[model samples]
Target chain A: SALRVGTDGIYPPHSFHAQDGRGELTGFDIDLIKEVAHRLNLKVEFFETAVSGLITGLDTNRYDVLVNVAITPERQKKYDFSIPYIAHRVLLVVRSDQQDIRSFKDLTDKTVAQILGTDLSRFAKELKSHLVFSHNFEQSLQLLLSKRTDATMIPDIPFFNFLERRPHDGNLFKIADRMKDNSAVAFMMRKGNNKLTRSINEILCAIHLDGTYKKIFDRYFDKNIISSVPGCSS
Target chain B: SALRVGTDGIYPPHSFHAQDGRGELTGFDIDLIKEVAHRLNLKVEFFETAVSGLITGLDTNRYDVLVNVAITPERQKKYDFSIPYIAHRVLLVVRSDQQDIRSFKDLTDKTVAQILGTDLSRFAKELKSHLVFSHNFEQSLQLLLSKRTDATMIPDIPFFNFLERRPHDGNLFKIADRMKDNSAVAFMMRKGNNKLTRSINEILCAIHLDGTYKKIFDRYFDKNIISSVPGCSS
Candidate 1:
């Protein structure tokens, strides 16, 4: 069976189009999924889904499983999540040269370019930051650089990938590192895709136990996310 | 639909029978699944399945879901797991007043009351301990107290509950404790039971976000295990 994988294609370091933007997908998720497909003995295909309509697409059978999604309480009602494959610290980032903000406590009444319909957006609101909706992490960064927003929240691994790729033409500083905690990202499926979901989780858990996961992780991220490794004991 | 719950009814503090031995069930899992059923508006029932045949019973339609089963990689291929509802430290517990066994590092060649077919058994083997198979935690404690085994490995939460109920006539102390790391326990369902699994996961995640899970944890434990809280940020 083919693994029909869906992802928000605009999230850099996770999934996105290349420099040509001619429909060639590339990034951490793209590479990782290819490996998973190889191990699971499934032919793989990718679909670029927009964040707003991602779950709707999954519900409609647009894809068998999702990549780059963070498990959330609200979504758990209608979706099944595989064990998380990546756990990364969430950070409040501002222009590298900024001096006013040093921590999350400094963000009251500040404007943040929070991506619409994400845990971070809700969290940004809870931090008392005024939110400006952005499409994805790159767009949020652009909004921050263009002075449209005071700050943006991003996962540490993606920010590292973003830094290595763009250097931001400047850079960003993590003002509130670890304050927002971490995001444990995993695969999402419609409520009855248990066979597919479990297959992915089993394959991924083995990937973690071996060096396969860390090898792929090091290709895109500097650290490891072992917090969500599968299994428990009596 | 009613919630059919299966468990290894011999493991005290998680799932086991009461003193009257009247087939009445009571434990952390008993209370937890009841709360889950209450919140999900499903009538509930329980079935006692041996540890070796727990998944078999689940596969045969004897139960809709299982409590006290950990999310092992081997099981992930054939089952669906709710987001973990409890995470507790796995420990090497010894009879109190023992002077020798101080840490997991000191466990080489020592006999451990290891339950067969559980992650802890696999881990105890890895620790280089000679394994003596036991049926459950209470049985392991019996073996340890009877000098059949040098020590037993148990999760901290269960140990606390055990102490509260039995006090062991001599008590037990956690000598080689956190060295064994933690166990994140969740409900296990047969593959394709995603609807039931997600509903349970949804209910439990909300319980975590609120104070409900902590309240239940406090009722059975001296410490909190928030390590497996559901959801993540982008």
Candidate 2:
């Protein structure tokens, strides 16, 4: 019924620059949100914003729909989140050759890498001083490959998907241990956009029921290595 | 034995201005951590540091523990967190008598205010350009009352609790239906510090099993209005 969507700009695979360089949005989120807009018959305009600004912008009414916000109790107040489109889990990746590192203790003296400007960076504050920090997951992986860092950590889905996309390059990374988490990604709107919120939710529910959601998910995950990334630590 | 730890110089009531003032880190978190440290028999050391450099200093191994952190999933990857002591829900507060008042929709075309230099400010970017940026929440709140803006958003508990503690002349305020989030507050430590992480978690578990955790919770939430601010129009 209404339009104007906002989202984080840099989240790749979920969203990023289109091949044409005109900044067309793509990924499962883009497709799914576009479907919602179609169902509602609303002319949707997209605003690429950061996660931090999304809710506040919603509260101030700068945009109508906030895309890709994870549904959590904290976010529930200022904005409304739709049904989940993607569920993800965090993974710990360590050096391929560092077999003695069965646990964190083994890498006590070694440098481990995490991304800058993320919760990972803040989480690292909880670590011992020996762990090093990196700018992104890619850089973190590079550190591990270069032996500059002992381990790198990130969510499971993307890491393994990267492996399948570049099998030989990803073979170097391995899940470290039992640390895991499951979370869902949802579209967000400022609180009280209930009519629009429900309209979108209805579409998602229908898509899920009609196998559209599954079709999309399965299409991307059909040969994905997520089924095996955690299984083989090596 | 656990070590007595120090935190920011100005977090007050949470970690500042103890009765003696030789300097004390007081609060539900500080008390709980101290009890854990006592049980472990590790000597406690207190150091006064500024908030900005606290996390970096922790990474550099400057302190054994820091009690300031909102334990979000993103943070979990970089640092090890002790069990949560405080669960904070960020709130978006608006002036009373706004129209279309039932939902977050009312926020559009309205100016929203927030305090600067707090977690609230960090999220400003997420909101985009719809906000009337302020130097601090106090100043923002003043402007809201003066009709310079439509609403002022803040962490729900602290803002209201502080308001309740201090007598105010204006009562024309209503908490918006939007609830930003619920985050567990925990102590931060470096990532690779498994010894300290395990020790802290163990101590947390011990304190948690006893009535100690609830005791701290009760202490902070002694106010009369524990529920959502009256007539929170969803």
DockQ for every model comes to 0.31, 0.01
Kindly state the fnat score of candidate 2: 0.00
lDDT of 2 by residue, A67-180 (tens): 645444445444555534455555667767667566544545556777554454445445552566664455667777898877765666556656655679776767776342
Best by lDDT: 1
Q: How accurate is candidate 2 locally (lDDT)?
A: 0.57
Question: For every model in order, what is the iRMS?
Answer: 4.0, 17.9
For A44-119, candidate 1 gives per-residue lDDT tens digits of 8888767877877788997887887776776776677877676666777897767787777777788989888777
Which residue pairs in candidate 1 have backbone atoms (N, alpha carbon, C) closer than 3 angstroms, thus clashing? none
**Considering every candidate listed, which one attains the maximal DockQ?**
1
TM-score of chain A of 1: 0.83
| TM-score, every prediction | 0.72, 0.43
What's the residue-level lDDT of A181 in candidate 1? 39
Candidate 1 — which residues are off by over 4 angstroms? A8-12, A16-28, A48-62, A87-110, A116-135, A153-184, A218-234, B8-12, B16-27, B47-62, B87-110, B116-135, B151-184, B218-226, B232-234
Worst 10 residues of 1 chain A by lDDT: A225-234
